[PDB]
Every structure is written in C-alpha cells, then in structure tokens.
C-alpha cells in the first residue's frame, strides 16, 4: 500500500406500561450523590423517586398507549370551510377552487407544528349542507386537481370531464363522502417549517413573500361544483375534515404560544405578546 492515509447511542424499547417503583430504604454515605445534577450538560435529571425518598413497591399497570403519536393525531379535525353562495360577493357561478392548505385552523395546526417533519396518509371526510344546516336534494362533484392539471374556470369547464383526475360525485342528502389519500410529497416528509427560499436569485423586499414557502408542501387544488348546466338555487357550505393515519413524526419543537395570524408564516401580534403562563402578585403567595 503506497498511501496509508487512504484507508447511535440510542435504541427503541417497548414500554407498554409505566415504570414500577422499587421499594428503597435509607442511604447514609459519602461519594454518592444522586440528588446533585449539572443541567449545563444539556441532559435532563436522572434522579428517581427512590434516590430522594424511601419508597414502597408499586406494580404500575398504567398504559402508555394513548400517548403514542398515532392516537394523538388520528382524530378527524376541521381543516377547511368552503362556501358557495347563490347571491353576493363570492362565487355565485356554482363552482369553487380551493388551494389545499391545512394551516387555516388553529386546533389541528398547533398539534402538527409540535413537530418539524411529518409523513402520513390521511382520511378526508366531506360534510356538506346549507348555511343553516338544512339538507336538500343537490348533486355535487368534488375533484382533486394536482399541480399542473387545468383548473376548472366555470361550472361547465371541460376539466370536469375528469378523465384522469379523481372525482367524487355525491348528493347533499347522502352521508358525508369519505376517501383515503396517500403521502404525496416529492420529498420524504411534509415539513411545517422551511427556513429557506423556493428559488435562487436576489431576494428583494418585493419578493420576501417567498420566504418559508416549500413546493414540497403544495399539493394542488380541490375543486367543487353543483352538477348541472343551470345555476342551483341553493347556498352550499362544505366542511372538510382530515384524519391522519400511518403517521411518523420527527424533531419536536416548542408549542405555539401566540395567536395565529396567517396561514403561511409564524408572524405574531407584536404589541400584544401573551405570556405563556398566567400571572400573580408576589412570588411567595399563591
């Protein structure tokens, strides 16, 4: 050989129940000090009940299953309200195009933002009715328009031929429509936070709205209409619910503690910065 120079301390465990407590007695000695720690290392304390007090034995059968990320997320929650009025400002044309973005509602958003990256399949349920909750015999069409596919421009656009895009035809009187959706990102996981820009070039203040936008999260358009060449006399409200399933999450982060202002960024109300915890008068009184 002519040139010599050319030649994870963590594993998963199955913990179905909470740790038991072993009985301990008194310890009176030197050299050993379990109560003293050094938080500077970045590690959490390893001290346990038996190190600081005399304990009895407790056979703990308390389950740890409900805190599995799967059971935390697999509960359908509202992610969009699409209205289609008959008279007024909004689309009175009998059709609506909605760009898919699940960051419009707080409850579900705060739960997802607990993690940086998430990969999952989802069950979407479509609850439709009139603005006052009544139901009428109306035929509807829901169509998924992937990025790059022609978006319908009217109630009779050719796009509704849906020869390749997946469509769902259902009556407002039928039960809520429901379908399963796979993990569709071009990347290996969706990311609720993208500290970067989508393209190269200079980033002048005129295009600062690009910051934080990652195409890997842009899944396309969800189009809906009333099936017919004539206008429908009924106002329609579509509530979309998403249920995460077969989920995997990476990198936990601090939970949102300021009200949400916009879908596409973490901006907060600067003049009214809420304190994470409520306050009191003195530090020595409850």
């Amino acid at each position: 050989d002519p040139i010599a120079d050319m030649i994870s301390l963590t594993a998963l465990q199955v913990l179905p129940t909470a740790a038991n407590t072993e009985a301990s007695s008194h310890r009176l000695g030197t050299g050993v000090v379990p109560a003293l720690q050094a938080a500077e290392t970045g590690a959490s304390s390893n001290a346990s009940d038996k190190n600081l007090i005399e304990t009895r034995c407790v056979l703990n059968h308390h389950s740890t299953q409900e805190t599995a990320i799967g059971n935390f997320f697999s509960r359908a929650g509202l992610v969009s309200i699409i209205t289609m009025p008959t008279t007024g400002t909004q689309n009175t044309d009998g059709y609506v195009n909605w760009d898919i973005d699940l960051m419009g509602y707080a409850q579900l958003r705060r739960k997802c933002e607990l993690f940086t990256y998430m990969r999952f399949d989802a069950e979407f349920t479509f609850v439709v009715a009139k603005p006052n909750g009544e139901l009428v015999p109306q035929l509807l069409q829901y169509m998924y328009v992937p990025p790059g596919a022609p978006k319908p421009t009217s109630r009779d656009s050719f796009a509704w031929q849906t020869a390749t895009n997946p469509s769902v035809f259902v009556k407002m009187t039928d039960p809520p429509a429901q379908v399963s959706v796979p993990f569709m990102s071009p990347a290996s996981a969706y990311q609720w936070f993208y500290d970067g820009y989508p393209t190269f070039g200079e980033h002048l203040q005129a295009n600062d709205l690009d910051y934080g936008q990652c195409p890997n999260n842009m899944m396309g358009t969800f189009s809906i209409r009333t099936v017919g060449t004539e206008k429908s006399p009924h106002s329609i409200t579509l509530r979309v619910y998403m249920r995460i399933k077969h989920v995997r999450a990476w990198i936990p982060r601090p939970l949102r503690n300021q009200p949400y202002l916009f879908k596409t960024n973490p901006n907060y109300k600067g003049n009214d910065i809420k304190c994470t915890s409520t306050s009191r008068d003195k530090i020595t009184t409850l």
């Binding site: 969706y190 936070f193 190269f200 601090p254």
Partner: protein, 245 residues
C-alpha cells in the same frame, strides 16, 4: 475527565479546561449519505480536510442588557474558505457540524447562556405591531451570514414560540460559575438527502442569555462570546459555475 477536552479535526485543534460534556444531537453522529437514501446519480466530491475543519466567526460582546443572537447553517460559511467555494460551485450539499461556543469570565462574574440548535428555524415579524400587516423578514434577517443577527423578542424567539421550551432541542448551558463553553455535534437533518446550501438553512444556532450577565464595578466588563464551527462529512454534487445566491 469530563471538564477537560480536545477537539482535533483537519488542521485545527480546540482545547478547553472547563467543559460540561458534549452533546450529540438526537443521539446521532454525522455520516455521508448512503446509497439507499441518495437520489442524485453523479459521484459526489468529498474534500475532506479542506472543508471539515474548525472555522472561527466574528465575536459578539455580552452586555448586561443583550437580548441574544442567532446564526443559520450553512449560511454562516457559504462565503468562507474552501467550504464556501464548494458550496458556491455545487448545486447540492449536505453535512453535519460541530458547534463550539466559547465564553469565559472570572469566578466573580455570573450569568447563564442557553446555547441551542433549532432545525428549520423560520423567523416571523411583529406584523406591524397591530397584527394587520402581513410583513415578512428581509433577506438580511433570514440569512444574516457570518455576522449573525440579534433577537428582538427572545421570549418568543422572534417566531411566536416560547423560549422556555427551547431545551426540547439539542442544547447546553454556559453557566459562568461552571463551564466556559458549549459543544454540540449536529447530524444532517432534512426531508431530502442533499439540498442547496444557498436556498435552505437546515438549522439555526441560538445563544441567549436567560440569566443576565452581572459583575461588580471594577471587574472586566468586556465579556466576549465566540463561535467556532466545523463541517463534518461535507459532500457536494451537481458541479457547475459558481453562484453566490
């Protein structure tokens, strides 16, 4: 045997006689991208010692009223040494990092700095104060370069999230009575095996004085904080002409 330490990589060596162990972010060491995860087909270039070495960025001055600072990776080095050059000439890049934040005082000074690594550190604005203006951070704030930037609202990390929970991220404390540095080894984290060193910052480094600096009049008042970092397992692909942004 835990307070003393030496970090030697490339043609550089760091020493410290008052450390508090070392943190391996999420328990994983940096590593080159394996063939199962890779997608780009060209043979990567792995410069080794010319880019995986320690680089010392500008020093900051810790004052009794400092808010805190932050830097973004790999932005901080995109224009330094042979690392910067490879980052500019190649479309794709990936690597880990060894972060060593330094700060020493005297046995009479006091104060505690929280040094943390927050991946995908997306910043937010105060929305014009009232919250009716959908303003956005300027390029100079999202990617402050080697000089780093100052936090205006450390309590919410300038992003609507509680600093009190930042310890959920790889971190160390530099508590003046205990240690004079912090060391965190960070592996590559992304949803893709390689990425642009220019358009995407994988994580941000935050140094925040949670316990304000304090000392009696007469004691040295210039207490600097220096940041030294070293890329680890730096790989590059998609060669072409140099591009700064």
């Amino acid at each position: 045997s835990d307070r003393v330490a030496q970090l030697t990589i490339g043609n550089s060596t760091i020493t410290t006689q008052e450390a508090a162990n070392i943190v391996i972010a999420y328990g994983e060491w940096p590593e080159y991208c394996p063939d199962t995860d890779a997608t780009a087909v060209d043979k990567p270039t792995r410069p080794d010692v010319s880019v995986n070495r320690f680089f010392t960025l500008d020093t900051k001055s810790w004052a009794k009223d400092s808010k805190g600072w932050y830097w973004k990776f790999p932005d901080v080095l995109t224009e330094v040494g042979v690392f910067g050059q490879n980052a500019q000439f190649h479309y794709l890049y990936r690597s880990g990092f060894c972060v060593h934040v330094q700060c020493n005082a005297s046995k009479f000074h006091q104060g505690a700095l929280l040094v943390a690594v927050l991946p995908e550190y997306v910043l937010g604005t105060i929305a014009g104060g009232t919250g009716n203006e959908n303003s956005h951070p300027p390029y100079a704030t999202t990617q402050p370069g080697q000089v780093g930037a100052v936090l205006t609202h450390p309590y919410v990390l300038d992003a609507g999230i509680p600093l009190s929970q930042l310890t959920v991220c790889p971190h160390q404390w530099i508590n003046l009575r205990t240690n004079n540095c912090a060391t965190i080894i960070v592996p590559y984290m992304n949803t893709v095996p390689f990425d642009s060193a220019l358009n995407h910052c994988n994580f941000g480094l935050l140094v925040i004085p949670v316990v304000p600096l304090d000392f009696n009049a007469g004691a040295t008042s210039e207490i600097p904080i220096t940041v030294t970092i070293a890329p680890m397992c730096a790989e590059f692909a998609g060669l072409r002409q140099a591009v700064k942004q």
